[PDB]
Amino acid sequence: GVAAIFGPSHSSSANAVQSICNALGVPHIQTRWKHQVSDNKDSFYVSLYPDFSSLSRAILDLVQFFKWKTVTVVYDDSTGLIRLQELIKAPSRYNLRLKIRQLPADTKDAKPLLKEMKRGKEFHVIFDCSHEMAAGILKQALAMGMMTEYYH
Amino acid sequence: THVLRFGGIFEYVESGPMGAEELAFRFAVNTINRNRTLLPNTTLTYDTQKINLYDSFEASKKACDQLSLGVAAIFGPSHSSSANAVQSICNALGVPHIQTRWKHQVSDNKDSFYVSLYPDFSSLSRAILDLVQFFKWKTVTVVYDDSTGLIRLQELIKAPSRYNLRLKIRQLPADTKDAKPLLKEMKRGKEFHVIFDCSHEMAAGILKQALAMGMMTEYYHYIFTTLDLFALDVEPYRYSGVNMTGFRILNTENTQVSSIIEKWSMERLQAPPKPDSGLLDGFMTTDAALMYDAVHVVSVAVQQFPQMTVSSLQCNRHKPWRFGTRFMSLIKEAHWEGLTGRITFNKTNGLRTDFDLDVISLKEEGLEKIGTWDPASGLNMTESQKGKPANITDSLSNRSLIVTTILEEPYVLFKKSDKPLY
Amino acid sequence: QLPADTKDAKPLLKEMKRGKEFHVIFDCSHEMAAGILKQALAMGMMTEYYH
Amino acid sequence: TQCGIWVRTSNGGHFASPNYPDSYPPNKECIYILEAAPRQRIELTFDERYYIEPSFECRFDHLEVRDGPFGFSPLIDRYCGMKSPALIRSTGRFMWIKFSSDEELEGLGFRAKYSFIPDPDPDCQFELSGADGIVRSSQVEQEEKTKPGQAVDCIWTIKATPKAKIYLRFLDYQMEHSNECKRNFVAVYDGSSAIENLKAKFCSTVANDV
Numbered sequence: 002g003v004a005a006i007f008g009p010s011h012s013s014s015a016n017a018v019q020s021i022c023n024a025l026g027v028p029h030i031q032t033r034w035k036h037q038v039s040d041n042k043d044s045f046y047v048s049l050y051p052d053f054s055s056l057s058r059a060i061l062d063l064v065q066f067f068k069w070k071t072v073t074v075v076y077d078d079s080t081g082l083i084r085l086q087e088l089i090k091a092p093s094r095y096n097l098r099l100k101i102r103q104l105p106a107d108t109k110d111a112k113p114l115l116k117e118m119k120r121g122k123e124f125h126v127i128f129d130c131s132h133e134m135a136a137g138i139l140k141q142a143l144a145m146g147m148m149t150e151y152y153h
Numbered sequence: 154t155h156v157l158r159f160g161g162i163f164e165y166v167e168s169g170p171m172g173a174e175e176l177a178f179r180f181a182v183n184t185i186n187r188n189r190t191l192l193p194n195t196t197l198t199y200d201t202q203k204i205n206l207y208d209s210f211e212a213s214k215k216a217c218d219q220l221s222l223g224v225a226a227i228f229g230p231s232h233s234s235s236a237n238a239v240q241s242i243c244n245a246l247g248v249p250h251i252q253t254r255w256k257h258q259v260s261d262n263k264d265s266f267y268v269s270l271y272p273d274f275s276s277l278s279r280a281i282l283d284l285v286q287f288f289k290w291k292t293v294t295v296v297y298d299d300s301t302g303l304i305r306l307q308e309l310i311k312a313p314s315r316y317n318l319r320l321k322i323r324q325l326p327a328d329t330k331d332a333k334p335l336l337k338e339m340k341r342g343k344e345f346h347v348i349f350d351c352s353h354e355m356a357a358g359i360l361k362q363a364l365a366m367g368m369m370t371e372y373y374h375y376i377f378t379t380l381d382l383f384a385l386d387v388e389p390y391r392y393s394g395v396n397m398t399g400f401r402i403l404n405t406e407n408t409q410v411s412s413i414i415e416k417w418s419m420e421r422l423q424a425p426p427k428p429d430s431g432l433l434d435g436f437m438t439t440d441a442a443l444m445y446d447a448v449h450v451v452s453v454a455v456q457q458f459p460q461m462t463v464s465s466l467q468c469n470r471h472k473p474w475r476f477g478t479r480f481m482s483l484i485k486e487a488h489w490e491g492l493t494g495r496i497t498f499n500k501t502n503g504l505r506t507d508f509d510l511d512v513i514s515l516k517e518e519g520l521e522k523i524g525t526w527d528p529a530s531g532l533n534m535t536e537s538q539k540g541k542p543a544n545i546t547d548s549l550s551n552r553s554l555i556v557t558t559i560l561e562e563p564y565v566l567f568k569k570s571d572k573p574l575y
Numbered sequence: 576q577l578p579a580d581t582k583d584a585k586p587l588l589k590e591m592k593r594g595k596e597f598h599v600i601f602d603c604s605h606e607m608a609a610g611i612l613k614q615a616l617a618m619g620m621m622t623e624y625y626h
Numbered sequence: 627t628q629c630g631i632w633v634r635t636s637n638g639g640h641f642a643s644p645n646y647p648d649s650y651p652p653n654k655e656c657i658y659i660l661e662a663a664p665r666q667r668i669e670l671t672f673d674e675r676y677y678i679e680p681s682f683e684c685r686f687d688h689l690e691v692r693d694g695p696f697g698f699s700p701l702i703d704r705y706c707g708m709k710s711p712a713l714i715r716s717t718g719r720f721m722w723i724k725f726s727s728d729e730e731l732e733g734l735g736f737r738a739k740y741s742f743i744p745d746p747d748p749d750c751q752f753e754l755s756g757a758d759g760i761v762r763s764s765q766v767e768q769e770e771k772t773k774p775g776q777a778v779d780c781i782w783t784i785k786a787t788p789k790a791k792i793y794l795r796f797l798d799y800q801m802e803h804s805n806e807c808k809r810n811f812v813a814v815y816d817g818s819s820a821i822e823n824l825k826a827k828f829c830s831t832v833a834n835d836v
């Protein structure tokens with residue numbers, strides 16, 4: 002007997018607890034983003050992570066305030082295309098040039114990746130990592146020559 | 154022996170007839186029970202249930218109801234919300250879970266008792282990428298329908314980084330079948346090469362709305378992703394001069410395959426008349442074909458293991474089932490020649506990443522096979538046919554006067570140079 | 576000229592399409608100008624080039 | 627060129643990478659030449675220790691094992707990557723190994739094992755050196771390296787005086803089929819023989835002094 006369920010906080014298991022809380026009627030409070038399946042009729046869930054139909058507008062307003070033309074979105078797992086989907090669809094309606102890449106599987110060695118980003122003259126990057134792994138890229142972008150005033 | 158019991162979790166229609174998945178599962182169990190030469194001293198029994206396909210709690214109850222009653226496999230609730238909920242039950246109890254539609258594998262999910270039969274999109278999205286290079290395209294315009302469709306085509310989104318393309322990703326509206334605000338922007342933007350990522354039930358509704366607009370001439374070329382393109386009504390579109398390349402895993406050239414499909418539409422007398430849809434008559438779609446193979450691939454595994462006592466397992470009293478550890482292996486190294494070609498599974502995951510596609514295309518006689526894709530080979534396309542009488546693009550008075558000329562100074566002599574003049 | 580009484584202008588409209596003929600002055604009745612436009616829509620002769 | 631594992635005993639021409647097995651420095655452009663005394667079905671048996679960088683296409687940081695005593699040869703494979711190669715048969719009397727490197731990499735290198743069994747069953751190599759010498763095309767005819775009635779392919783190595791550079795100049799230059807590079811030419815590959823450092827490829831009438 003409880004009054005709310007404060008989230009198991011992962012896309013595999015948060016959808017399994019959401020359908021329990023819908024069936025029994027108790028509220029399910031989520032604190033991390035989750036792919037809402039578009040035909041899921043659920044009414045007893047509420048999320049507090051800022052939804053990526055608003056964060057991916059804020060990045061799109063920020064790649065236009067900086068007057069960019071060639072961004073190079075780098076995500077980490079396949080869910081990261083659902084998160085930044087208002088930025089993937091952006092060159093259709095604006096003047097950009099998306100050049101989407103992906104970090105390796107679980108190994109924190111982006112040095113085969115950052116060689117291609119350096120040879121390809123890719124100066125504007127929109128990393129989609131967690132902060133625990135955005136630190137590990139910046140060490141490997143400092144060990145390469147990708148930390149000067151050209152890169153943003 | 155005590156015979157067997159396969160489980161099954163399918164959709165719950167309210168007033169309509171049975172779904173294409175559940176009826177094919179009921180058809181495949183009966184067909185093996187007729188023909189004795191497969192499973193000679195073993196007949197099958199099924200225990201199908203019906204869920205709401207969007208309620209993972211209902212799928213978890215009906216899975217535990219079949220496990221407590223005692224089954225040998227669970228043939229998939231067939232949706233990303235509820236297939237992940239039944240997969241973790243079948244992992245915990247040890248029984249195999251056979252999937253017949255694609256599902257997002259979360260990259261850190263350590264599961265070993267699932268096996269999929271839908272062709273994995275780390276191979277279909279290579280086959281489309283080999284097909285947008287055989288056609289020498291430079292500007293594709295991938296159109297998906299829901300947010301999961303970026304996970305499916307992710308080897309095609311990442312493609313302009315390593316090749317010379319220009320992706321211009323769009324999205325259909327929410328659930329309304331009105332792509333006419335979309336197709337105006339695709340027409341004004343001069344977008345001639347489209348890689349639709351719809352199901353066949355909604356790829357028909359776009360082509361009616363692309364014919365009502367002026368987007369069905371010989372300039373436009375539409376690769377589809379869906380595997381049920383052969384069951385698409387194409388009679389209004391056939392003389393337009395368009396190009397509609399697709400794929401097809403349902404091997405409708407083997408006479409044994411075509412005999413089953415004739416038995417399919419005969420036994421399916423519950424096929425509703427629906428002219429406003431845009432589809433053909435009752436065909437076995439590739440959703441119902443992969444359920445027909447899923448019963449046969451598991452039946453190979455029960456043939457090679459006559460020691461399989463189906464036990465009753467409670468979800469509350471957590472205890473792994475005895476024979477399921479060996480029985481899951483006998484599914485993964487099973488080979489079968491089903492309706493969808495060769496069936497083999499990738500030993501690392503349990504997915505189909507090795508399969509035989511047939512590249513079909515729209516010519517003025519209908520949909521005709523023009524190629525063959527295979528992950529080991531690539532596009533071995535037939536590709537050299539005449540069909541229509543030939544033309545000519547050269548003529549006389551461009552003949553170029555062979556002037557025989559000896560060399561002798563000052564009259565004719567080679568230029569003094571260093572680079573290879575020719 | 577359209578065929579005799581058969582409403583199959585599709586052997587005709589292939590020649591009008593291959594011949595690059597974009598401006599047409601049909602002289603039909605309205606009962607048969609409908610039947611051509613269905614057979615000009617089933618072919619690729621209903622875009623913004625044709626008038 | 628600082629490729630300090632070579633050891634060259636009669637069978638057992640056992641070489642490994644520069645700074646093996648610690649690392650190898652950037653901009654290293656090693657030209658393991660491998661004389662390959664006539665026998666023995668030239669053997670490239672590698673170690674499992676292998677970090678010749680997994681670049682795409684092996685566009686950089688690669689391990690040319692091109693089957694020639696030179697650069698323009700039948701290529702075997704650009705072996706970059708993570709998994710180690712093994713056991714190239716290669717029935718030539720030769721092997722050319724170009725170990726290269728870019729500027730921003732990591733590495734450990736490789737190791738190589740020599741000497742398979744079988745029989746010894748054109749070969750000009752006019753090694754010229756020192757000061758001003760002469761290079762003559764008739765040296766293949768005076769010194770019986772080829773016979774009249776077959777295709778010729780010679781190599782004129784021109785190793786300098788110590789601490790020097792080389793100025794080629796053409797005294798005589800006359801081609802039997804002028805303005806055509808597919809059946810005769812003269813190329814002036816500098817450094818070592820590789821398709822990259824091709825200074826000039828003359829097959830027209832006049833050869834300029836490189």
Ligand SMILES: *[C@@H]1O[C@H](CO)[C@@H](O[C@@H]2O[C@H](CO)[C@@H](O[C@@H]3O[C@H](CO[C@H]4O[C@H](CO)[C@@H](O)[C@H](O)[C@@H]4O)[C@@H](O)[C@H](O[C@H]4O[C@H](CO)[C@@H](O)[C@H](O)[C@@H]4O)[C@@H]3O)[C@H](O)[C@H]2NC(C)=O)[C@H](O)[C@H]1NC(C)=O
Nearest residue numbers: 275279283499501502504506528529530531532680683707
């Ligand atoms: C399922 O099992 C398969 C094998 O049975 C495992 O392998 C994956 O699937 C394919 C295997 O062919 C891989 O994709 C292909 O990669 C080829 C090159 O592989 C190496 O390339 C470089 C080394 O040069 C490495 O960086 C890389 O990691 C690999 O080691 C390509 O040649 C293939 O090209 C395709 O196009 C060409 C056109 O030239 C055609 O010949 C074919 O169409 C061909 O398919 C293709 O790119 C894939 O990378 C493998 N790995 C992974 C992680 O997916 C799978 O691991 C296993 N599981 C799954 C989920 O698939």
Ligand SMILES: *[C@@H]1O[C@H](CO)[C@@H](O[C@@H]2O[C@H](CO)[C@@H](O)[C@H](O)[C@H]2NC(C)=O)[C@H](O)[C@H]1NC(C)=O
Nearest residue numbers: 371393394395396514515516538539540541542
């Ligand atoms: C794209 O559509 C065109 C028709 O607009 C196809 O072209 C014809 O293909 C047949 C095949 O037998 C040939 O006989 C004809 O000569 C082709 N031309 C014409 C004007 O009819 C073409 O095959 C389609 N492309 C693909 C890849 O399917």
Ligand SMILES: *[C@@H]1O[C@H](CO)[C@@H](O)[C@H](O)[C@H]1NC(C)=O
Nearest residue numbers: 184185187188189190191409
């Ligand atoms: C029974 O199955 C075999 C496959 O081994 C097939 O060749 C045969 O035609 C089938 N017979 C009937 C009556 O279905």
Ligand SMILES: *[C@@H]1O[C@H](CO)[C@@H](O)[C@H](O)[C@H]1NC(C)=O
Nearest residue numbers: 154192193194195456457459
């Ligand atoms: C058929 O029956 C025999 C004896 O009744 C039994 O030994 C065998 O396992 C059965 N199944 C087969 C041959 O697949």
Ligand SMILES: *[C@@H]1O[C@H](CO)[C@@H](O)[C@H](O)[C@H]1NC(C)=O
Nearest residue numbers: 524525530531532533534535
């Ligand atoms: C492709 O398939 C055909 C079958 O008609 C075969 O003849 C051919 O050898 C195959 N391979 C290639 C590379 O064409």
